Amino acid sequence: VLSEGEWQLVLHVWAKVEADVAGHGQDILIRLFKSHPETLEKFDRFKHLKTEAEMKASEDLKKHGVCVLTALGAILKKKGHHEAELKPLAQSHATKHKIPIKYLEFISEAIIHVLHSRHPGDFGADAQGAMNKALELFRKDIAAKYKELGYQG
């Protein structure tokens, strides 16, 4: 469980993310695919993109980035009260996309990397700690919902 102060640090940096959702989304997905290339194999629409420049030019990848950060933003703003938001995401990611928790660890590392790169003055040790805790909570809760659906990834 995060403290109220921890949630405030998470939502303070998230407001900065919301000034440019699409640009954050692009940077996060590109960082994920660069750091952990096996994650790109999960994306039929995107696995054909071969360079960073093709990735940045893809309207499709940019729209996807917005849909990822919009879902994650809605979950974070519930401060842990996220069952109704998390359940459909678990359903699709367990049963259709088949995304293991280790891949959610990879995208969480990418989120932290981009937030630190873009907003270091609003993302110091205590804010990084808080965001790490919020994303650990997200991964714990989605793993439980994965298992309810019969997915052990």
Ligand code: HEM
């Ligand atoms: C913070 C973590 C994540 C969030 C919030 C999230 C959110 C979403 C959303 C909102 C969609 C569209 C609706 C849906 O199908 O559920 C989606 C689709 C998808 N996600 Fe995720 N996602 C996350 C992590 C990942 C990771 C790490 C992978 C793969 C390594 C992945 C693979 C996919 C795929 C393959 C689709 C379908 C994209 C398409 O073909 O249109 N997701 N994601």
